[PDB]
Design a protein around this ligand. Structure first.
Ligand SMILES: [Mg+2]
Ligand SMILES: [Mg+2]
Lengths: 244, 244
């Protein structure tokens, strides 16, 4: 089964995210930097300070779903995902709760801009965030996915309400705007070089070695490929020393 | 072959580190935070400002060696590693060169505290660092491994010369001292919680989902286990949703 080959390729990165103190230190580092950024942020007169935050693998830890995929040789499946969301077993990314609550009690507002589905995944999402200790998880704070996965228009909606976004937190570059949405990794890397100065300042990164826009970035039409085509794209992407 | 199963488990994390703009953004974020830390660092009168930096997967990118392991189903092998080092094809972790040069030209000194071998890996190391553009790669800047892998005694040696280490940069928690050297991941995670405030400040983390002290941290005597025992430890470490 090519599906076993596909999920086994995630095992080491899953181990790292789930078990290592290194992963946790990177989460703390991101949220420590995010606090400094928020403290220093200067906002135009008339505006209120907003922080925009992605959820999955930024504030919520869905690693148990990945653990289930590995154990059962399952590729991603939207219906399996909703059952996970409704299981209400999401964990918190280290640092995230304390950061969220800090912002919200110090003249800011965190907005959750997320591609969990507004229709079917809102309830489990809000339940888990309350349980995990996030302050300000009222409906109005959430900009969940409707039709589009691209996030900029939701950022814009927030700006329409007299907020100035002072920072953006995410594990995916598409959490920072639409510049490289649906683009291959060369373009995505180019965006990062162009915006080098913003990282750890206006753009706050969380680590995610398991999935994301970088995965689709491995090859043209990657997500439309079958399991074998996806494995091939992963393997063809490998940069290797010749052994000499 | 269990050895194929072992290296295939690294593929996705290797793809991430090698190809994603996200990895690069995390490297920039770490080095942007490191610059802020260095700018603000206050040192006791009489002392000179030191920065201590690990090399492999902190300032030097050895991902092509990992790419060769995957392509050839090879576990880690010290002799293969030296040939890689002597190949002189090391790449630079994004941000690292600019950070190193900044410190060294602004009343600081970067010291390279590294477990590349002093005897046999020094020459290739220095060659690659000069080629990559690191300033101050004279012999005296390097504290390469002799007998011990633990790093604290080398940090102490630096402190003996009238330096105060203002920050430490690494991809491994053992790059920050000896508190959790050779310990399992629970202890390692506990260290991170105890030192939560230092991350992105005094302790600067780089991402490494491919290998490290966290790998040995998966199980008691992990590095002494055969390939099958190591795969088992990885798999047994997986935290999984029950699917309901
Ligand atoms: Mg996310
Ligand atoms: Mg290292």
């Amino acid at each position: 089964q090519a599906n076993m080959q596909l999920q086994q390729q995630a095992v080491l990165g899953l181990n790292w995210m789930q078990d290592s103190g290194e992963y946790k230190a990177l989460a703390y580092q991101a949220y420590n930097a995010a606090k400094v950024a928020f403290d220093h942020a200067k906002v135009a007169k008339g505006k209120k300070k907003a922080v925009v935050a992605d959820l999955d693998e930024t504030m919520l830890d869905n690693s148990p779903y990945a653990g289930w995929q590995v154990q059962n040789n399952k590729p991603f499946d939207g219906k399996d995902w909703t059952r996970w969301v409704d299981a209400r077993q999401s964990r918190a990314v280290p640092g995230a709760v304390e950061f969220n609550n800090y912002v919200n009690s110090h003249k800011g507002k965190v907005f959750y801009v997320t591609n969990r589905k507004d229709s079917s995944e809102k309830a489990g999402t809000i339940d888990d965030m309350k349980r995990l200790g996030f302050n300000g998880v009222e409906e109005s704070a959430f900009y969940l996915k409707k039709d589009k996965s691209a996030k900029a228009a939701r950022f814009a909606e927030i700006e329409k309400q007299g907020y100035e976004i002072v920072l953006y937190v995410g594990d995916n570059l598409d959490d920072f705007g639409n510049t490289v949405y649906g683009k291959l990794n060369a373009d995505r890397r180019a965006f990062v070089d162009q915006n080098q100065g913003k990282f750890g300042k206006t753009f706050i990164m969380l680590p995610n070695a398991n999935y994301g826009g970088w995965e689709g970035g491995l090859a043209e039409g990657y997500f439309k490929k079958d399991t074998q085509g996806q494995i091939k794209a992963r393997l063809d992407a490998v940069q290797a020393w010749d052994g000499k």
